[PDB]
Amino acid sequence: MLTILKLGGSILSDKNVPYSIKWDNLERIAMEIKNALDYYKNQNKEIKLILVHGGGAFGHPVAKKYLKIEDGKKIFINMEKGFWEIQRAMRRFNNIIIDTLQSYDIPAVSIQPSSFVVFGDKLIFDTSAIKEMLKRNLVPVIHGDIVIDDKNGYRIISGDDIVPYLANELKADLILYATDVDGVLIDNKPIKRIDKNNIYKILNYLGMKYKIEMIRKNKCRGFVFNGNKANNIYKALLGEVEGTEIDF
Amino acid sequence: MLTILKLGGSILSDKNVPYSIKWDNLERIAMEIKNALDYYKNQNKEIKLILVHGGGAFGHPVAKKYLKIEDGKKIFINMEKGFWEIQRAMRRFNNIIIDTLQSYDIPAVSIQPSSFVVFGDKLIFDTSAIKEMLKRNLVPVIHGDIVIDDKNGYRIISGDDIVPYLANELKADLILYATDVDGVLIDNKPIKRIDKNNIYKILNYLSGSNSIDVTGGMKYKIEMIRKNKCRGFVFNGNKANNIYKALLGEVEGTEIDFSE
Numbered sequence A: 001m002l003t004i005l006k007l008g009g010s011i012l013s014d015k016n017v018p019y020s021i022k023w024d025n026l027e028r029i030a031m032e033i034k035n036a037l038d039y040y041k042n043q044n045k046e047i048k049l050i051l052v053h054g055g056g057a058f059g060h061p062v063a064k065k066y067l068k069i070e071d072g073k074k075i076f077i078n079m080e081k082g083f084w085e086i087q088r089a090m091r092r093f094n095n096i097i098i099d100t101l102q103s104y105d106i107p108a109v110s111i112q113p114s115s116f117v118v119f120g121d122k123l124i125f126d127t128s129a130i131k132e133m134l135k136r137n138l139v140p141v142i143h144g145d146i147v148i149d150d151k152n153g154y155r156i157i158s159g160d161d162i163v164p165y166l167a168n169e170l171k172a173d174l175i176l177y178a179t180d181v182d183g184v185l186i187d188n189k190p191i192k193r194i195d196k197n198n199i200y201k202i203l204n205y206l207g208m209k210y211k212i213e214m215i216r217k218n219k220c221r222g223f224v225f226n227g228n229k230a231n232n233i234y235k236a237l238l239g240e241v242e243g244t245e246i247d248f
Numbered sequence B: 001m002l003t004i005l006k007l008g009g010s011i012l013s014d015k016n017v018p019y020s021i022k023w024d025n026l027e028r029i030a031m032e033i034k035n036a037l038d039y040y041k042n043q044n045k046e047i048k049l050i051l052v053h054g055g056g057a058f059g060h061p062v063a064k065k066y067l068k069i070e071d072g073k074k075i076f077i078n079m080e081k082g083f084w085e086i087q088r089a090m091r092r093f094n095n096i097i098i099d100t101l102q103s104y105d106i107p108a109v110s111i112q113p114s115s116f117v118v119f120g121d122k123l124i125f126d127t128s129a130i131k132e133m134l135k136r137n138l139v140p141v142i143h144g145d146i147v148i149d150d151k152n153g154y155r156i157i158s159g160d161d162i163v164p165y166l167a168n169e170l171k172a173d174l175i176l177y178a179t180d181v182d183g184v185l186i187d188n189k190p191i192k193r194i195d196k197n198n199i200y201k202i203l204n205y206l207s208g209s210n211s212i213d214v215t216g217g218m219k220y221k222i223e224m225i226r227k228n229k230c231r232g233f234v235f236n237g238n239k240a241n242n243i244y245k246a247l248l249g250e251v252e253g254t255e256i257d258f259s260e
């Protein structure tokens, strides 16, 4: 029924190249998603799909201009300008991704967190709109953004936040983390799986820490795999496993 | 005190010219909003400000393509393309407006209804984020947009839906309607005041055959002000300084008072 596919801010834009886009990779990814959705239409199987991407070479480079170290602590200043400028950057990125998805007849739509998400001690994030969108078989595309934080003023909600939240808030059947590594790497090897068992000895060794952690905190079950290898995204969507499983 | 300024009529954009932008007007408007903010600082008086704009030559033109009359009613079709297409056009318009506002150091930020608003018989419209933005003295810029409803459909939410809703939710003290005309025209002349001693008398005239506005636009604005027990002005947003004055509470168009 409901799958959430995160596109790791990396396979979409080169983070060391401010304002860059990996066009061919992006166009391939859109195609695989399209082929996947098409596959389901054939099996006459109804699938609901949400998409998340990061700030890639857009969010971060601009955010940077408004983060200064106040004694080992990231601080946002000049947000009278910074809030918009970070919104704008993320909008450019969001537009580019949605347009490309659209060119493949993928019914993508923009979800812009900065407008309504408050990263308060208790995350505030009304999903009413998204649930409706899913009833119409639209594909909400959500992105890491700048958001208000009723405690610290501003925060940079990331995909790793949105994904688990929504998976749980919406009861997602499948969770996908597309990225530039074949899965969670230990000693440079993608562990086949991650449970309640070998978990303990992994948090220690330490998808990164942040993820794994608040994706067990929601008792989720997602796959971390490589979005750069042609066909991986397609397969991932059909309920295959090509990377690291994280069950909770 | 919380003010909501609606940039309406066609003061920002000529809807008969695809993707029209009245640059000069928009730039002057930003100035005036600036003059006003700088003023309220010098007089050490706290002002929270929200701006709202419509679709102009961006919304309706694009939306038209996805609207049909079926069995007498309106209905949205092909929204697998349509929803983004309308979002896209409204995002562009918002960008241009906010960029210009920022170019005058107005701390404007974007509020995109399409992403989170559900058009029911009551709006589902979480204003939490807006509250925190005002708290930090940002200027939230909300715009008419496409939105899903709770009945298998879609609906255009206008400034007309947004303003009233926010005035209630945030308890605004001042509503400002910048329009294409000098106020509520009663005999090609704007009525100075409209209060609980002439409202019905005015509403009834507005329904008449001598009224210059048959659109039922004024009637609606008047009613929302009373409904919120606050104050509002309907003025010509095309006249130099009207927006600055209005923001100070002294513009000369039509006052509507049901505060207290």
Ligand SMILES: C=C(C)CCOP(=O)(O)OP(=O)(O)O
Pocket (backbone or CB within 6 Å): A009, A053, A054, A055, A056, A059, A060, A063, A090, A143, A144, A145, A146, A156, A157, A158, A159, A160
């Ligand atoms: C920075 C913004 C606005 C987007 C969030 O970042 P990503 O989710 O893409 O990556 P992280 O920096 O959070 O790891």
Ligand SMILES: C=C(C)CCOP(=O)(O)OP(=O)(O)O
Pocket (backbone or CB within 6 Å): B053, B054, B055, B056, B059, B060, B063, B086, B090, B143, B144, B145, B146, B156, B157, B158, B159, B160
């Ligand atoms: C996307 C669209 C069409 C927004 C229009 O909102 P308005 O505030 O202009 O509402 P109307 O004038 O169209 O009634």
